[PDB]
């Protein structure tokens, strides 16, 4: 199977360069083009440019000339994109993709994307708080939650009972207020099962090495 | 440079119906020697990378079921999805590869379903948070349709309109519903000046808001 392995999220300071890898496997690296695509959060796809690792030749979207530099290393089957003198305009997910050069000219396999945040602000761990119903009877189902507050940068992940509670889960998109993110996650279980069986949110913020478990306990 | 125009910008259809969407290019994508249009369609679901569906205007990619069909030629292209499923909610992009590469701006596919009132829940601040000086009050408005909703906070009956942070999920593929979270953050000191805290949800499913409340004193 064809696969493109990209690196995880990066927080970089304004004015610096960031170089990100795209490690190809499962096919002949020198027979296909690698293209790069930018996506700002909640926005559309924008083509950056492409490299043919066979020859080292490139083409670019005019907008990205002298912002993006594409290279490739044949011996490691890795393509790189370097962004120079970054600004908050460069904060986006960047995908690499295999382009079936010479036949379809279509991007048939895509990496998972490298999320770049360009900010001078410091990495901050989240505070994790339980959301349990008030001690005053609020039917057959109960909704619980986890408030994940005051972290930077993205992402955090939230699971319930280490992934074993999967249904009835809503994890909300993070919102940015004053250079800090907040999100919440909701989970709904039969009101017979809680609190007799335990419900715990498992929060991870890899950038600050945070791995927290918050047990939801009934109030009073 | 080739400009790609997609329409409509978004579309709402019921599960089982056929959807059609348009992609136009500022120049022909047909090359006479090769006899192919260099036009591809990609699907992007929330939180996922784009996936190739169709290339050369009408050739389906590996594994893609035949209910996705690309058609057209030259400057005029169409993507048809028959028997739309809830799991098809995505943004669909066209992309030319005649000369350099250009993505269209996308058509967002939403699913229509039966109206559903939100299940509303209110959560007083945790002991943990209060001990540190903060007081966040959270309201979930879960599994509703349609997406448009209003939330108002009241503190002892008076509307309160800041310290409020709202967030909305993507449409859920499991049930075609939406959900919303609304969080009111105060200091502990401000929180301790008032007794009743209320979140009120106004949705087209009822002319009367759904009210959930707790009293700081119980």
């Amino acid at each position: 199977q064809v696969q493109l392995q990209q690196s995880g999220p990066e927080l970089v300071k304004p004015g610096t360069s960031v170089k990100m890898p795209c490690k190809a496997s499962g096919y002949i690296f020198t027979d296909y083009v690698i293209s790069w695509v930018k996506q700002r959060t909640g926005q559309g796809l924008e083509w950056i440019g492409e490299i043919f690792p066979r020859s080292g030749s490139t083409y670019y979207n005019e907008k990205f000339k002298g912002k993006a530099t594409l290279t490739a290393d044949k011996s490691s089957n890795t393509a790189y994109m370097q962004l120079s003198s970054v600004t908050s305009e460069d904060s986006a997910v960047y995908f690499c993709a295999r382009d079936y050069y010479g036949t379809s000219f279509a991007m048939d396999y895509w990496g998972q994307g490298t999320s770049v945040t360009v900010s001078s602000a410091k990495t901050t761990p989240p505070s994790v708080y339980p959301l349990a119903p008030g001690s005053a009877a609020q039917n057959s189902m109960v909704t619980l939650g986890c408030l994940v507050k005051g972290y930077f940068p993205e992402p955090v992940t939230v699971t319930w009972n280490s992934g074993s509670l999967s249904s009835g889960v809503h994890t909300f998109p993070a919102v940015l207020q004053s250079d800090l993110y907040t999100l919440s996650s909701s989970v709904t279980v039969p009101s017979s099962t809680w609190p007799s069986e335990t419900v715990t949110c498992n929060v991870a913020h890899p950038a600050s090495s945070t791995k927290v478990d918050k047990k939801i306990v009934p109030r009073d | 440079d080739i400009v790609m125009s997609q329409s409509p910008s978004s579309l709402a259809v019921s599960a089982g119906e056929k959807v059609t969407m348009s992609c136009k290019s500022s120049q022909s994508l047909l090359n006479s020697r090769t006899r192919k249009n260099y036009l591809a369609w990609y699907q992007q679901k929330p939180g996922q990378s784009p996936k190739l569906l169709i290339y050369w205007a009408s050739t389906r990619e590996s594994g893609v079921p035949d209910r996705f069909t690309g058609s057209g030629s030259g400057t005029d292209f169409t993507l048809t999805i028959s028997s739309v499923q809830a799991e098809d909610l995505a943004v669909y992009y066209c992309k030319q590869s005649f000369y350099l590469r250009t993505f269209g701006g996308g058509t967002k596919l939403d699913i229509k379903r039966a109206d559903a009132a939100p299940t509303v829940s209110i959560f007083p601040p945790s002991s943990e948070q209060l001990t540190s000086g903060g007081a966040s009050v959270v309201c979930f408005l879960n599994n509703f349709y349609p997406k448009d909703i209003n939330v108002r906070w009241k503190i002892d009956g008076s509307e309160r309109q800041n310290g409020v942070l709202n967030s909305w999920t993507d449409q859920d593929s499991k049930d075609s519903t939406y959900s919303m979270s609304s969080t009111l953050t105060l200091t502990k000191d401000e929180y301790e000046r008032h007794n009743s805290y209320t979140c009120e949800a106004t949705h087209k499913t009822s002319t009367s808001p759904i009210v959930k409340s707790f009293n700081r004193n119980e």
Binding site: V33, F52, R54, S55, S57, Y59, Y101, F105 | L29, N31, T34, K36, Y38, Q96, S97, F98, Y99, L100, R101
Partner: peptide, 8 residues
């Protein structure tokens, strides 16, 4: 060689 698209 390395052409910019299918039109080439």
């Amino acid at each position: 060689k390395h052409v910019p698209g299918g039109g080439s």
